[PDB]
Design an enzyme around this catalytic site. Structure first.
Site, mmCIF file in Angstrom:
data_model
loop_
_atom_site.group_PDB
_atom_site.id
_atom_site.type_symbol
_atom_site.label_atom_id
_atom_site.label_comp_id
_atom_site.label_asym_id
_atom_site.label_seq_id
_atom_site.Cartn_x
_atom_site.Cartn_y
_atom_site.Cartn_z
ATOM 1 N N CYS B 105 0.838 -1.191 0.000
ATOM 2 C CA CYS B 105 0.000 0.000 0.000
ATOM 3 C C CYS B 105 0.877 1.247 0.000
ATOM 4 O O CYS B 105 1.625 1.490 0.959
ATOM 5 C CB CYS B 105 -0.928 -0.001 1.212
ATOM 6 S SG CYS B 105 -2.069 1.416 1.246
ATOM 7 N N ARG B 108 -0.082 4.590 2.759
ATOM 8 C CA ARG B 108 -0.026 4.433 4.207
ATOM 9 C C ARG B 108 0.355 5.704 4.960
ATOM 10 O O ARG B 108 0.372 5.653 6.190
ATOM 11 C CB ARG B 108 0.937 3.317 4.574
ATOM 12 C CG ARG B 108 0.427 1.944 4.210
ATOM 13 C CD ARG B 108 1.468 0.900 4.539
ATOM 14 N NE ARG B 108 2.456 0.754 3.474
ATOM 15 C CZ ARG B 108 3.635 0.167 3.639
ATOM 16 N NH1 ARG B 108 3.967 -0.312 4.833
ATOM 17 N NH2 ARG B 108 4.474 0.043 2.609
ATOM 18 N N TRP B 277 -9.446 5.947 -1.077
ATOM 19 C CA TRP B 277 -9.724 6.632 -2.329
ATOM 20 C C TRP B 277 -8.653 6.213 -3.328
ATOM 21 O O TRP B 277 -7.558 5.791 -2.946
ATOM 22 C CB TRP B 277 -9.757 8.162 -2.178
ATOM 23 C CG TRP B 277 -8.552 8.746 -1.539
ATOM 24 C CD1 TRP B 277 -7.345 8.994 -2.136
ATOM 25 C CD2 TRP B 277 -8.426 9.178 -0.179
ATOM 26 N NE1 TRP B 277 -6.470 9.542 -1.221
ATOM 27 C CE2 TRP B 277 -7.109 9.662 -0.013
ATOM 28 C CE3 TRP B 277 -9.291 9.186 0.922
ATOM 29 C CZ2 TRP B 277 -6.642 10.164 1.205
ATOM 30 C CZ3 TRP B 277 -8.826 9.686 2.134
ATOM 31 C CH2 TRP B 277 -7.517 10.170 2.264
ATOM 32 N N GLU B 282 -4.350 3.410 -10.756
ATOM 33 C CA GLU B 282 -5.129 2.188 -10.585
ATOM 34 C C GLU B 282 -6.258 2.112 -11.603
ATOM 35 O O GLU B 282 -6.516 1.045 -12.168
ATOM 36 C CB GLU B 282 -5.706 2.101 -9.188
ATOM 37 C CG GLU B 282 -4.715 1.958 -8.079
ATOM 38 C CD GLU B 282 -5.460 1.887 -6.757
ATOM 39 O OE1 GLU B 282 -5.782 0.761 -6.306
ATOM 40 O OE2 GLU B 282 -5.781 2.965 -6.207
#
Ligand code: HEM
Ligand code: HEM
Ligand SMILES: Nc1cccc(CCCCNCc2cccc(OCc3ccc4ccc(N)nc4c3)c2)n1
Ligand SMILES: Nc1cccc(CCCCNCc2cccc(OCc3ccc4ccc(N)nc4c3)c2)n1
Ligand SMILES: [Cl-]
Ligand SMILES: [Cl-]
Ligand SMILES: [Gd]
Ligand SMILES: [Gd]
Ligand SMILES: [Gd]
Ligand SMILES: [Zn+2]
EC number: 1.14.13.39
Lengths: 401, 401
Positions: B105, B108, B277, B282
């Site tokens: 991720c 973070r 979000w 992506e």
């Protein structure tokens, strides 16, 4: 045997070749260190034995007459002299395998097509320079580049190493400026300072080709200037951004790594420079756009009249793409071999399928195979890969200063 | 034994001392690195003791008062029942740590701002649906997205699991054809077929929002239609390419992963949907441009009149950048929270620096932190990373069939 999936297609293979991995990497079950840049006669004998086996496998003569003879010959020579000598054909096979085994190389579809120059008789730095000039001339081939390696004498007891101090045969100087900045290539500041320390009269351009510091055994390095007409260069222009030519950017034709160690059957060649042709991202993305390299991205974006005040305009992405376009266009215009990251990554996928059928796998470093722009647009992004060390190999070695 | 970690853009060095705490073992060995692969009774007290210890040091209360007290009740609860219930503060604290600990991720830096909905008293697919509907509407917040996780009841022996069968709360349908190929999202094809196989009326289009398949313990799953006013979507258009909107492309506002298993202090929550979000790549790069996803790259290049006949025109890179531009533009125009990959990665560098001071390192998966376009234009590309498993954690889990 690790299972390896291709996520674009659904393909699955198992890498049985990794099981033959001899030397160990930096990862453990606790922590992966895959992203890090830099991770006794009887042990000499086992590496030599394994290599001789590899060679006699390649000539479809495993377990044959010649094969056991060579095994005994090498053993006898190690017992008698502490080391041994490769036959010419074994050296050629070992240099190609070293390329074939290099996990960070996306160009390995070419591995079988490598011109090997045997310089193992080289006597001095002056002869070393001559061999290197012939390598550059052969490899450049007026812009129709040819993959080549020149192999200088192996490491041996009682004598120092042949070493090329330069990290590549062609590099631009990097001069620490008056006001603390760097004029030229900041990657090359140290070797620039070594050349000046060794009597080189510096320039003050941004694209000054460096002299070679060549080290013969038990000798200080010697400075050798490359004749300008040997170093083929490409002025950079853009097919539709005519102001791009006024940036005054150039790059050289020939990528020739000169500071890596070649290992074959336990023997070490600290001086064995090799060369191919560029993939355009190496120049357009890394060399020209890294903040710590020529760092041209903002200047280009500004001249493109992009909005550089907000990141969400993707001004960086747009300017980098055109810098890569300029690189490909200029090299094609100059008739100097070059491959784009789409063609290169597609041929690496063919390499992986070839290697799966040939050897049951292929060592690959995903972080180095995936190009630095447009990663998931290329097929290698969606390909899981297994990274491991096979010999013969190209290895990093410490700087000789 | 403390891995040296270098940033190659700046030259800075750190040591990951946090790596020493790794609990579950990764897939890597000294002989081969598998970092690029997507997927590699009283032991409960060990991970419970450990988690309670983390919690109290994090509130500056190691070795005092409620710590020893809470140490005893978990001991008593396991002795008396074979498991234990988390205090609400611990469940909150554990949810934030699983996020903070997710090595893949890049978002973070936000880990301390997370809204934790406690659905541990849930008991029916109908009950879940109202929870999941609270979440979605809270998380979406009319386009001002807020990070959130709903924790459904933990796993206990002798009773089937709470499971959300969709990989996300919002997924577009994928329909096979009279000729194999897929209309809609090819990645969902399978769940689309399960939803139909449980009585869903399939639409015809390329962006039909799938229904939820919610599984209460020891029951078949029930279909649940989502309220269309609850699923905020963004019609895709481009600032200067007026025809882009005519391609009829859309994506949804809320990225909410609903198939991962939350693990806190030895406890296992197979149903724990978390949402954030989107990072624009992506949607723009992976979802729209992967060959096995919407695969629109070529359609956009035709519309842009690009030379798709030669890879070296970099038409794919050009089309891709414009698709990401469209995503960022459309989401901002609709005032739906989105972050571009430059902003996102710069914040992650800031997160690494915080985490170095706070815990002495940060487990990070280079291959997933570096964005899928313009990799080396972002700072994380030049940052060495160490990947390892810390607990609490989000883990992958099998599909419930
Ligand atoms: C013929 C065309 C070739 C192409 C297009 C090519 C491409 C590349 C690229 C893009 C990299 C990564 C460089 C970076 O990002 O720093 C690389 C690395 C490498 N290549 Fe190739 N290469 C070619 C030929 C060769 C040859 C002829 C050899 C040796 C015989 C070779 C051996 C290596 C090695 C050892 C590395 C790793 C370098 C390092 O770790 O710093 N390549 N290659
Ligand atoms: C708030 C803004 C957030 C952003 C921009 C963000 C961004 C991302 C991205 C880009 C990925 C890579 C996934 C892929 O490439 O398919 C990812 C993975 C992941 N994120 Fe975050 N995320 C956010 C919030 C969260 C939250 C709230 C959680 C949990 C509480 C979370 C946990 C994870 C996990 C576990 C993964 C790995 C998922 C997997 O392996 O499939 N993230 N995130
Ligand atoms: N055409 C050809 C033909 C033959 C050979 C070559 C390769 C040129 C090799 C030059 N070797 C330069 C180098 C070495 C070590 C590090 C470097 O930068 C640091 C760095 C940091 C993080 C990275 C993350 C991913 C990644 N892929 N690279 C990274 C590099 C550069 N080319
Ligand atoms: N905004 C936000 C906010 C919160 C959470 C998220 C995460 C979205 C998750 C959707 N995704 C999940 C997933 C799982 C498994 C595989 C996936 O894809 C296949 C694949 C294959 C190779 C890769 C190599 C490198 C790399 N980086 N990714 C790869 C992905 C996706 N997002
Ligand atoms: Cl280079
Ligand atoms: Cl997604
Ligand atoms: Gd023009
Ligand atoms: Gd200028
Ligand atoms: Gd037109
Ligand atoms: Zn690893």
């Amino acid at each position: 045997f690790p299972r390896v999936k291709n996520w674009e297609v659904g393909s699955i293979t198992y890498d049985t070749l990794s099981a033959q991995a001899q030397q160990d990497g930096p990862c453990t079950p606790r922590r992966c260190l895959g992203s890090l840049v830099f991770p006794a006669p009887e042990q000499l004998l086992s590496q030599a034995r394994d290599f001789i086996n590899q060679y006699y496998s390649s000539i479809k003569r495993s377990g044959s007459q010649a094969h056991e003879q060579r095994l005994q010959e090498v053993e006898a020579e190690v017992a008698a002299t502490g080391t041994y000598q490769l036959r010419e054909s074994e050296l050629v096979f070992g240099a190609k395998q070293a390329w074939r085994n290099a996990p960070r190389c996306v160009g390995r579809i070419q591995w079988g097509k490598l011109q090997v120059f045997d310089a193992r008789d080289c006597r001095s730095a002056q002869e070393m320079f001559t061999y290197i000039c012939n390598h550059i001339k052969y490899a450049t081939n007026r812009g129709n580049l040819r993959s080549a390696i020149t192999v200088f004498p192996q490491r041996c007891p009682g004598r120092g190493d042949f070493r090329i101090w330069n990290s590549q045969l062609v590099r631009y100087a990097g001069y620490r400026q008056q006001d603390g900045s760097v004029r030229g290539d900041p990657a090359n500041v140290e070797i620039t300072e070594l050349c000046i320390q060794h009597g080189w009269t510096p320039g003050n351009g941004r694209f000054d080709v460096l002299p070679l510091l060549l080290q013969a055994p038990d000798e200080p390095p010697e400075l050798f200037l490359l004749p300008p007409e040997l170093v083929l260069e490409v002025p950079l222009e853009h097919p539709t951004l005519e102001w791009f030519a006024a940036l005054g950017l150039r790059w050289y034709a020939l990528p020739a790594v000169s500071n890596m160690l070649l290992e074959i059957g336990g023997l070490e060649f600290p001086a064995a420079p090799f060369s191919g042709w560029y993939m355009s991202t190496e120049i357009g993305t890394r060399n020209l756009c890294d903040p710590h390299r020529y760092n041209i991205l903002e200047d280009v974006a500004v001249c493109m009249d992009l909005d550089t005040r907000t990141t969400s305009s993707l001004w960086k992405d747009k300017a980098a793409v055109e810098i890569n376009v300029a690189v490909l266009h200029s090299y094609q215009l100059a008739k100097v071999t070059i491959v784009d990251h789409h063609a290169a990554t597609a041929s690496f996928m063919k390499h992986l399928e070839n290697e799966q059928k040939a050897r049951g796998g292929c060592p690959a470093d995903w972080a180095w195979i995936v190009p630095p722009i447009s990663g998931s647009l290329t097929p290698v992004f969606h390909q899981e890969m297994v990274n491991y060390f096979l010999s013969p190999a190209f290895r990093y070695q410490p700087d000789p200063w």
